[model samples]
Target: PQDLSEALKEATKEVHTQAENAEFMRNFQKGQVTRDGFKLVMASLYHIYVALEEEIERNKESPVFAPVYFPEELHRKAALEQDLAFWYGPRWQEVIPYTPAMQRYVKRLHEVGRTEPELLVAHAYTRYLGALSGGQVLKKIAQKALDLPSSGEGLAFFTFPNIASATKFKQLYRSRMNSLEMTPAVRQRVIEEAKTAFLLNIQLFEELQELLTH
Candidate 1:
């Protein structure tokens, strides 16, 4: 496909679905989220997003990343902080722990960010787009399952206050991604990196499930 967005979609469809249909995700949709499990999930995500957004900021000045920079709209670190604080109290930052799977993903993000900045799009697309889309469904599911406060106190990550229309924002994001010009090789590499992102997600889910069961 000529468009990077379409190409990314087609290339990542299988792996993306693999992450989507993960046992953890299936269980989550059914509201099987335990308090401990949710905490672990959120804790690991803090590390992962920390690596991802930090890299994003570092590269936002480059042609490879500048077009897609939307910090006010998509950045999650601050929201994640508020959420963890709500869930874990004011000591939230001190309590969150990391798993090996999360560390691996975080490591890969930094590696990619340092060595191949162009490929950063793959990670951002896989994670952020999923956050905007499926994460909406997850937010409601999490709220009902957790019986969280009606005020949406612990679910700040799912809120996108700056963007009025999710559909319109996604369209703009796709167009921005398509605006970038890259060599065919780089494009193909980006596709592969997307798969890597999904794989990391799958492992992280499985590992979290392991923590819950044992």
Candidate 2:
């Protein structure tokens, strides 16, 4: 039997790559997106992280959330807030609003947190890990595309201040994930949930692409 970490990586590989290659992501990587497009992406990300971190806090004490729960290391809400302020100024709260896709994504996060709390693990895995992974690449692309400074200000969301080494931190995260004890069936469900999380992300990218086109 494969370990849970490896199983998740294998199961979500195709969809994960699809997400990475999604139109929005591809354009952003190629620096083809406008500053407004980048801001739109950041707005969408703010809503997603708001929901994700809220649910994570709500479930931090659950047995399933405990082993891998590292709020100090993984929290992005503050970073998002800083970025939002930089981009939208003091009126950021009033200026930036969630897209319909972002609203739907938040709803899903809350639903999963309330009805199937264990699945929060999948959401966390999909989000935080991806942030630590390809997120670095996106940060560089964003810097060039938006003509931002090397760090701070609008880029706070992509900087992992608590983590010294993303590679080592990811290894620690995977070890924690694999340590969760679960029956075979439950583990399978978690794997499927992770894949679902990725699909939701892909949908978000597609929606954002449409928004940018219009």
Candidate 3:
């Protein structure tokens, strides 16, 4: 089996490929998947956002939980968002202009009575998880990361509920992929699109890290 870093490197490439394909589908193949589909994907991710928010809130009450590194990554991500305000400039501003889906998700989170910090942490985790768990390719990397001898500190983002073992996770994911109702070609296309997205994320992260370090 490939080592964790090697698996993650491949996974990162897949992410960039997925992003590119999704962008192409969004831009060129308009009739296939509408903006609403993208929004729905984002909405589905709200479930995960809520989960991490709950964890963060729970973490605040206990020193033991506070030791968990997940929150630290969330904090780092929040700082990056602030940094991105200048780094990405107008493009970033335009993209997150508080759409209805964003508003609804945020409001719903608030309604659940989470603290502001907790919500913000969850929001960042959602984006981070989206980058990590966006597609099957990344999930493969995630499985390898879990199996690696690392502390599993940074990998909390990739861990999902209903997953038992890394091997099981990959098996189930492949089974799920095979069971999809779409034609084989369409499914492959979606998979490719997802890989493109993962690769784009690698580039985005690489650039972001360069700026952050400088």
Candidate 4:
């Protein structure tokens, strides 16, 4: 009914606050980055993104998703690998934990991409756009709270070396998304899936908070 970007932003607004209000997120906001910040959270995101980009590669050629496929501009799998290496060394892949919460998100990503490819936009929108904005904030929040070395060793995931301007890139992204035609029924499904994406993430954070506090 509206611009797909606006539709997603409006549909997911409440769930967005749930993410911001998650206890784990609140602590990070207060500069209490903890074990969950750079390590646990980072590792969890690594698995989820691996599943996501895997599906992206599978579906990028389809007309339904081709316009929005910009792997070079927004892919985070490699950056995540870099950060994981800095945190866990050469054996980062084996060392990183793959919690059930993260696996659930990964499972759904594969399901959507394999069956309902159009819905992949919902996942991409929730992540990449937020990465451009919230991830930028976290880059600084993390550097100070974790007291990381000033060199960009462990924080490669936050810096988008390819995007010269986040604001302009998002505008182009939204326009590209709007260009994709969708049935009214499919549009509603996409909107609902975007909110579900946030739900899966919230649960992940809550699980982490419990793990971290224990």
Candidate 5:
């Protein structure tokens, strides 16, 4: 039988591609996204990561969470804040309001954190792994597309200061995931949850695309 890590990778493959091929992502990759569009994306991400990291903290003590809760390495709320400040200035709090899509995403994070906290593993894996993987590629695209400073000031969200080697870190992460002990039923649920996570992300991208067009 395949290990949990492999299963997650296999199961999320299609959804992951759909997310990558999202209209917003495709435009961003082609350096076609405007500065306003980029900031909109950043603002939406700020809300999502805020809720996600909060849930990570809320469930850090769970047996399922403890093994993988590397706060120093995986936390993004601070970086996201820095990026938002760069884009929206110091009064970003007043400038960037959460879109309905963002609100729904946060609510889902909170709901899962409250009831099915173990499912956070799926969320964390979906987020952090993507950050380590395609995130680097997007960072470069964003830099050129926006013609932003290269000092990492505005692009802090894409920078993982604590993670020296994304490749090695992801390997360790998968190892930890594979080490987790769960019933086949629970494992199946987690896999399904991971797919759901991707779906949520896809929905956010689709909504944002519609928003940008308007």
Candidate 6:
């Protein structure tokens, strides 16, 4: 267990370094990526979730949990009902809409849902943990919002659900982890990749933080 944890941590750092140097970052900073760098980041994130949706679905019955869902209505609400696109900024609006990549990912998730519900559920379950960690990152940003007023709006996406207590949820989540029906090898791979994702996400945010700070 300790060895796996250590390896995950190391892998996370390496992935973060790669993401830091990814083409996306260079394009994002120069205002040359797509005219909607912020939106592209959001779309990219959505793409990742789309990729994991099927996995989340597969793991549903495997004693796993998914902390966050796609919240498709929320996306539409932000765009149409609230005019969040207009208020947020043109870049935000342009990028807020799901990209072709996201659409394809959603379609794949749907196919997985229909054909392999168990695996889908399990994947969702594991992805939820990923979401939870991601939520933690958002919380960190929200806490730092006093330094940057614009951050509050961006941080809203990470706020916890309307549940009364996180304790019960944590307990349930832990139980589910214990109940997952995965072999050691498969579990190890899922865990490692998930950790890598989290690390890479944090590094991305770190870059944003640098941009916002200066």
Worst 10 residues of 5 by lDDT: 143-152
Candidate 1 residue spans exceeding 4 A from truth: 150-152
Taken over the whole model, the C-alpha lDDT of each candidate is 0.89, 0.87, 0.38, 0.90, 0.88, 0.45
What tens-digit string does per-residue lDDT give for candidate 1 at 94-173? 77787799999999999999999999999999888888878878888887788766765888888888899989999999
Winning model by TM-score: 4
- By summed lDDT, which 10 consecutive residues of candidate 1 come out lowest? 143-152
Q: In terms of TM-score, which candidate is stronger, 4 or 6? A: 4
lDDT of 4 by residue, 143-178 (tens): 888886666688888888899999999999999999
TM-score, cand. 2 vs. native: 0.95
Q: Residue 121 in candidate 1 has what lDDT?
A: 94
Clashes of each: 0, 0, 20, 0, 0, 22
Backbone clashes in model 5, listed as residue pairs? none
lDDT of 5: 0.88
lDDT of 1: 0.89
Residue 89 alpha-carbon offset, candidate 2, angstroms: 1.7
Model 2, 1-214: lDDT tens per residue? Answer: 3778888889999998898799987888778878888888889888998898888888888888888899999999898889989888889999996888888888989998888887788889999988998888888878877887665589888988899999999999999998888878888889999998888888988988887776
Model 3, residue 60: displacement in angstroms? 31
TM-scores of the candidates are 0.96, 0.95, 0.30, 0.97, 0.96, 0.46
* Candidate 6 lDDT score relative to the true structure: 0.45
The local lDDT score (0 to 100) that residue 86 gets in candidate 3 is 34
Superior candidate under TM-score, 3 versus 4: 4
Ranking by TM-score: 4, 1, 5, 2, 6, 3
